[PDB]
Amino acid sequence: ADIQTERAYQKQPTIFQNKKRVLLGETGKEKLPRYYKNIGLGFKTPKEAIEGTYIDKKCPFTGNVSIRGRILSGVVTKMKMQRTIVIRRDYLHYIRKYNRFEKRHKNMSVHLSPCFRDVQIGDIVTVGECRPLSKTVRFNVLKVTKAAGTK
Amino acid sequence: ARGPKKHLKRVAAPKHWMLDKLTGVFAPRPSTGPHKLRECLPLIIFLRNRLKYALTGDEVKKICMQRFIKIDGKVRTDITYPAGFMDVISIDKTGENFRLIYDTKGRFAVHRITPEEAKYKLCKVRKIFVGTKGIPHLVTHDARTIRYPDPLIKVNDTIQIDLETGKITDFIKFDTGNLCMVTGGANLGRIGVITNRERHPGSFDVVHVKDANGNSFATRLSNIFVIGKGNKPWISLPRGKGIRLTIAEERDKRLAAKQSSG
Amino acid sequence: GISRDNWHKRRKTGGKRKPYHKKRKYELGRPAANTKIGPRRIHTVRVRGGNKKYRALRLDVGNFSWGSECCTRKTRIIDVVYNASNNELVRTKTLVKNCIVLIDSTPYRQWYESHYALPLGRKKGAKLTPEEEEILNKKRSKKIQKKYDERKKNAKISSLLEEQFQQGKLLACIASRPGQCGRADGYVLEGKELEFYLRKIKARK
Amino acid sequence: KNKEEAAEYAKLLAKRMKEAREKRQEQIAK
Amino acid sequence: RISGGNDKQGFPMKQGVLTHGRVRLLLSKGHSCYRPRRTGERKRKSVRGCIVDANLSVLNLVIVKKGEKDIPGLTDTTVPRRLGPKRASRIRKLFNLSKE
RNA sequence: AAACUGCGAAUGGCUCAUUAAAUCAGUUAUGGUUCCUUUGGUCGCUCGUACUUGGAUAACUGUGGUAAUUCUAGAGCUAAUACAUGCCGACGGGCGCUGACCCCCUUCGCGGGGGGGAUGCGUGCAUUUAUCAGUGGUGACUCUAGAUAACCUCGGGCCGAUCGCACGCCGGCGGCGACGACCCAUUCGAACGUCUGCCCUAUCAACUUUCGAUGGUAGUCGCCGUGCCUACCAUGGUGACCACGGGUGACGGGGAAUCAGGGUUCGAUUCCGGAGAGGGAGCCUGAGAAACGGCUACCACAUCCAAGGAAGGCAGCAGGCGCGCAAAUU
């Protein structure tokens, strides 16, 4: 679509799109191979990442983000930011005096690559730790599992 | 703090140095060198606390500055020089060679070796990388860099270094069935055959090891040091062969030894 | 003498944070190198670890690459025409990374003429200046002539680049950071990137 | 020393690729 | 040649300070009228300006061209001038020696 | 002796004022950084006065000023592992791109090939940019290594103009060291992130919002990741699972007292981490400090003075005053 929405040109820094090609040797568009990498830890590169046109330098698959550290999960709580969502991690904290637990939660802002189209509120996301991407963001969505009630 | 620290409190010193608590406030802070601060034995602890060749640090300095102490074939005059695992200490004046080898309690034993064994040392290769227009390089736990290693040598293997020339003369691969010592953790100083390596991508691989008496333990891969091909070590082992007796068997052995005298 | 700490900022909750220590030297920042276009002027900066940064205050010349032809040349920088960050940087003609500049096309024109034996950016009314029809035509044997003829099959240049060569100055993007390395290196704009930046420049002016 | 080390590693590397090629040829042949 | 001096409070004259009075400068290594006590040390020091007025305790003068007659105790004496050249090339230059 | 040079003075010691997810603890990460020293490697890999180059300055001599200081100013010498400059040599050339010229064969449609090639440009490591190809490695690189086109900072980077000992060998070849310089590892770290955990308070229920608040794009700066800052854009982000605010006779922890089981209280205090040096702020040098037994300024206090100026920082060890119920030897 309209990839060039910013004031600066948007492109994958590792893909050279200005190679000289003669006109008569054209099959489809002239030349635009798409850069992507397979992240480790058994995660599958989304098909939209391989055959997409979006430009996201913070994408785990087509961007400049290396996933290393903790692999966590959460439920999507808010999706009101650009390429960023807020997930909620619920857990039980043990108070030893009463030998009991209490519900606590942490809100975590994670980068959502546009390769995960159709991500709802309430479905599980597996996020991986990366370098600080902004003031509060340090995790990238690596997998999206749909909610149980989602048809 | 600003900049690096230069002191070591006696109580913050590694416990395997077996330093007491009333001698002083400070422990000899190991100098920077081939081995890490907590995985080394400074020359002063070896020449004073283990060998009793000196009574004070002044006498350790007096010995070292006569150039009587060689570490890995080179004379060292730094009394806090960090000597670590597999390092060979040669005192030619007294004609004795030692190899710094862990005890089953996790301590560096006073293990005397023959002068023929003192010619070489085992080194666990820490990394292999290509640099300098295609030249392969190898880095060991001893922190020595070797150019043009054998193409079959990989990370976690063990090489044999001839101390006179410092080049690889043999190597054991990291394979199941090879003898290995443990150089860190709860099982430090134990010797056994590698049984299986469970791999955890993005985390620490765990290696399972079986003693010569049939006891099975496990460590992280970073704590495994291959000693010999098969179950035959390439170095001399201390009086305890890496078999960690339980406290009950230690008590029984001590009582049997005591009752045999008198 | 500015700072670069993250603890003077509000927390994620928006609450105020209390500084538990004074500014540290490693959190320091330095004034921006507003790299102008002019005769070369670089001030070396002593940085953490004892290393050196090259704070370019003035640069009139850079190293720019024609990517399709793989022709990298040293070239005078003429003007700053577009800045995606701040339009003011264009008004002050500041060289920063990713700013669009006009570079002299003469080195790339010279390489093209000496490589393809084809005129480029040359007005048809003119009949070449003295002492350059030789490098265009020369006295070559059959082998050299057939080599240049084989090169001629891949010598077509896109119309946008051709028009730029007629005007004598090319559009380029600065890809190095002049305030950190003292250099204004970059690449000539081509293809859809050139189309986008021409559209942006004409929309701005 | 540079020349001798380069020559020795050239010989050893050639022998190692010979061994690898022979082993892979035996593997594919059967 | 006027080579400096000290004002009535003893503060020495500094070459670049184009003032009649006394200023306070932050001086570092290399500057005159200052001797650093540790590496990188700079001190704020009072220095007298380079212009010669009547408010000087002493003025330093170096005779550059000799007059017509000797000045008693100044230009008629002799100097042992110890410490001849020590670097070998300086020895050759002084005595016009050759490589042989 | 002195003085120049080098190194250290960023450790240690003291104290607990600040500080309420801050510090800190365990856990991870740096594939997002810097690293003096130690240890190992690399260091004729660059095709372009050397049997040793230049000018200074200390110490020293001599002349001085001020009441006053670890104040220093003229003059006369003289060194370097200080500061600068700079070369034979390896060195024979190879490689890449050029291309006046010549040979052989096929069809005298050379549609094609194979070579030798003289002048010319550029070569190694490091830096910056662009492009290409897929030696080793990783769970995963936009890794490592390679190739190409060039750049290559006057505030210009490596490629030794150094010192000792032992002595030699038919102008040459040398043994053992010390010191120094890139670079790459290593060690010692530092820095910045991950996950979880902290006292009381609702007579604190909404807070933040370009005085960047949350995210995006581009940059700047920074050692590097990052609203760290800037410009545009979006309108976000946190909260009864207690946000925000307030209080703390609150540095955190290891730990201490008490304790049937469970708990309660304490932890300024010798170990680890943090912070500070009267209060703030700003820096210089350096690998490392926003250092205070470093500097600069203001604020408070305060010392000497010849009234012009000069010099300060015991929460170091003793010791004094003050404070107090309360704590030792100049």
Tab-separated table of N, CA and C (backbone and C1' of nucleotides) in Angstrom, chain F residues 48-75:
chain	number	residue	atom	x	y	z
F	48	G	P	55.775	2.083	-6.574
F	48	G	O5'	55.902	3.550	-5.969
F	48	G	C5'	57.019	3.921	-5.168
F	48	G	C4'	56.634	4.927	-4.111
F	48	G	C3'	57.800	5.665	-3.452
F	48	G	O3'	57.401	6.999	-3.143
F	48	G	C1'	56.574	4.497	-1.807
F	49	U	O5'	70.325	13.271	4.805
F	49	U	C5'	71.705	12.937	4.849
F	49	U	C4'	72.028	12.061	6.036
F	49	U	C3'	71.298	10.730	6.107
F	49	U	O3'	71.888	9.726	5.299
F	49	U	C1'	71.178	11.797	8.206
F	50	A	P	71.011	8.483	4.783
F	50	A	O5'	70.946	7.499	6.035
F	50	A	C5'	72.135	7.020	6.653
F	50	A	C4'	71.848	6.311	7.955
F	50	A	C3'	71.226	4.922	7.821
F	50	A	O3'	71.683	4.099	8.891
F	50	A	C1'	69.776	6.313	9.049
F	51	C	P	72.767	2.948	8.618
F	51	C	O5'	73.819	3.118	9.802
F	51	C	C5'	73.387	3.455	11.115
F	51	C	C4'	74.367	4.364	11.819
F	51	C	C3'	75.013	5.441	10.948
F	51	C	O3'	75.168	6.635	11.711
F	51	C	C1'	76.693	4.104	11.935
F	52	U	P	74.448	7.987	11.233
F	52	U	O5'	73.030	7.947	11.952
F	52	U	C5'	72.024	8.899	11.624
F	52	U	C4'	71.281	9.384	12.844
F	52	U	C3'	72.156	9.911	13.981
F	52	U	O3'	71.490	10.990	14.630
F	52	U	C1'	70.838	8.117	14.763
F	53	U	P	72.213	12.415	14.771
F	53	U	O5'	71.185	13.429	14.108
F	53	U	C5'	71.045	13.515	12.700
F	53	U	C4'	69.777	14.238	12.335
F	53	U	C3'	69.405	15.393	13.246
F	53	U	O3'	70.088	16.588	12.917
F	53	U	C1'	67.512	14.027	12.879
F	54	G	P	70.351	17.694	14.044
F	54	G	O5'	68.915	18.323	14.294
F	54	G	C5'	68.258	19.079	13.291
F	54	G	C4'	67.067	19.795	13.866
F	54	G	C3'	67.320	20.507	15.182
F	54	G	O3'	67.896	21.785	15.000
F	54	G	C1'	65.343	19.225	15.344
F	55	G	P	68.729	22.465	16.186
F	55	G	O5'	67.617	23.205	17.048
F	55	G	C5'	66.699	24.096	16.437
F	55	G	C4'	65.492	24.321	17.310
F	55	G	C3'	65.785	24.700	18.750
F	55	G	O3'	66.057	26.081	18.894
F	55	G	C1'	64.154	22.991	18.699
F	56	A	P	66.616	26.657	20.282
F	56	A	O5'	65.325	26.723	21.209
F	56	A	C5'	65.414	26.484	22.603
F	56	A	C4'	64.137	25.886	23.129
F	56	A	C3'	64.034	25.773	24.637
F	56	A	O3'	63.625	26.987	25.236
F	56	A	C1'	63.347	23.742	23.631
F	57	U	P	64.477	27.622	26.435
F	57	U	O5'	63.852	26.952	27.733
F	57	U	C5'	62.460	26.691	27.826
F	57	U	C4'	62.197	25.559	28.781
F	57	U	C3'	63.028	25.586	30.050
F	57	U	O3'	62.431	26.404	31.038
F	57	U	C1'	63.068	23.411	29.096
F	58	A	P	63.329	27.247	32.062
F	58	A	O5'	63.245	26.413	33.413
F	58	A	C5'	64.253	25.475	33.746
F	58	A	C4'	63.673	24.231	34.365
F	58	A	C3'	64.405	23.712	35.591
F	58	A	O3'	63.985	24.358	36.781
F	58	A	C1'	64.040	21.934	34.074
F	59	A	P	64.980	25.325	37.589
F	59	A	O5'	65.910	24.324	38.401
F	59	A	C5'	65.350	23.325	39.238
F	59	A	C4'	66.202	22.082	39.252
F	59	A	C3'	67.652	22.266	39.660
F	59	A	O3'	67.827	22.354	41.065
F	59	A	C1'	67.537	20.900	37.731
F	60	C	P	68.301	23.731	41.751
F	60	C	O5'	69.745	23.994	41.144
F	60	C	C5'	70.830	23.120	41.411
F	60	C	C4'	72.001	23.432	40.518
F	60	C	C3'	72.442	24.885	40.507
F	60	C	O3'	73.277	25.227	41.598
F	60	C	C1'	72.203	24.147	38.291
F	61	U	P	73.062	26.620	42.365
F	61	U	O5'	73.754	27.694	41.418
F	61	U	C5'	75.110	27.556	41.022
F	61	U	C4'	75.488	28.596	40.001
F	61	U	C3'	75.056	30.018	40.318
F	61	U	O3'	75.930	30.673	41.219
F	61	U	C1'	74.478	29.506	38.091
F	62	G	P	75.340	31.648	42.349
F	62	G	O5'	74.804	32.901	41.530
F	62	G	C5'	75.694	33.721	40.791
F	62	G	C4'	74.946	34.655	39.878
F	62	G	C3'	73.852	35.486	40.528
F	62	G	O3'	74.345	36.622	41.210
F	62	G	C1'	73.026	34.528	38.545
F	63	U	P	73.473	37.300	42.373
F	63	U	O5'	72.344	38.098	41.589
F	63	U	C5'	72.682	39.148	40.699
F	63	U	C4'	71.458	39.743	40.055
F	63	U	C3'	70.352	40.184	40.994
F	63	U	O3'	70.607	41.429	41.613
F	63	U	C1'	69.420	38.984	39.191
F	64	G	P	70.175	41.669	43.139
F	64	G	O5'	68.617	41.983	43.057
F	64	G	C5'	67.657	40.963	43.279
F	64	G	C4'	66.375	41.243	42.540
F	64	G	C3'	65.135	41.395	43.404
F	64	G	O3'	65.009	42.693	43.952
F	64	G	C1'	64.669	39.946	41.597
F	65	G	P	64.230	42.911	45.336
F	65	G	O5'	62.695	42.837	44.927
F	65	G	C5'	62.139	43.750	43.995
F	65	G	C4'	60.676	43.471	43.768
F	65	G	C3'	59.854	43.257	45.027
F	65	G	O3'	59.405	44.483	45.572
F	65	G	C1'	59.401	41.527	43.475
F	66	U	P	59.334	44.695	47.156
F	66	U	O5'	58.005	43.936	47.583
F	66	U	C5'	56.732	44.412	47.175
F	66	U	C4'	55.654	43.410	47.485
F	66	U	C3'	55.639	42.869	48.904
F	66	U	O3'	54.998	43.740	49.819
F	66	U	C1'	55.423	41.085	47.363
F	67	A	P	55.861	44.747	50.727
F	67	A	O5'	55.689	44.186	52.204
F	67	A	C5'	56.373	43.016	52.622
F	67	A	C4'	55.647	42.339	53.753
F	67	A	C3'	55.406	40.851	53.583
F	67	A	O3'	56.523	40.073	53.970
F	67	A	C1'	53.411	41.911	54.281
F	68	A	P	56.928	38.780	53.119
F	68	A	O5'	55.629	37.860	53.170
F	68	A	C5'	55.215	37.231	54.374
F	68	A	C4'	53.819	36.675	54.243
F	68	A	C3'	53.612	35.675	53.118
F	68	A	O3'	54.016	34.367	53.468
F	68	A	C1'	51.900	37.293	53.045
F	69	U	P	55.026	33.557	52.524
F	69	U	O5'	54.216	32.243	52.145
F	69	U	C5'	53.221	31.717	53.015
F	69	U	C4'	52.303	30.760	52.296
F	69	U	C3'	52.998	29.805	51.331
F	69	U	O3'	52.312	28.552	51.326
F	69	U	C1'	51.424	31.107	50.151
F	70	U	P	52.847	27.326	52.216
F	70	U	O5'	53.547	26.356	51.167
F	70	U	C5'	54.798	26.695	50.579
F	70	U	C4'	54.888	26.242	49.142
F	70	U	C3'	53.743	26.693	48.237
F	70	U	O3'	54.249	26.956	46.931
F	70	U	C1'	53.879	24.340	48.224
F	71	C	P	54.970	28.351	46.609
F	71	C	O5'	54.116	28.964	45.413
F	71	C	C5'	52.764	29.357	45.594
F	71	C	C4'	52.467	30.624	44.835
F	71	C	C3'	53.091	30.713	43.451
F	71	C	O3'	52.330	30.057	42.458
F	71	C	C1'	53.548	32.695	44.641
F	72	U	P	53.050	29.067	41.425
F	72	U	O5'	54.465	29.745	41.173
F	72	U	C5'	54.846	30.199	39.885
F	72	U	C4'	55.219	31.657	39.911
F	72	U	C3'	56.335	32.080	38.976
F	72	U	O3'	55.897	32.266	37.645
F	72	U	C1'	56.714	32.999	41.112
F	73	A	P	56.918	32.082	36.424
F	73	A	O5'	57.450	33.551	36.158
F	73	A	C5'	56.577	34.666	36.189
F	73	A	C4'	57.362	35.941	36.075
F	73	A	C3'	58.507	35.891	35.085
F	73	A	O3'	58.068	36.141	33.765
F	73	A	C1'	59.271	36.794	37.130
F	74	G	P	58.904	35.588	32.518
F	74	G	O5'	60.015	36.701	32.316
F	74	G	C5'	61.366	36.336	32.129
F	74	G	C4'	62.288	37.507	32.312
F	74	G	C3'	63.695	37.283	31.802
F	74	G	O3'	63.801	37.456	30.405
F	74	G	C1'	63.809	38.144	33.978
F	75	A	P	64.284	36.231	29.492
F	75	A	O5'	65.846	36.165	29.776
F	75	A	C5'	66.632	37.337	29.657
F	75	A	C4'	67.969	37.200	30.331
F	75	A	C3'	68.761	35.953	30.006
F	75	A	O3'	69.378	35.993	28.737
F	75	A	C1'	68.840	36.338	32.322
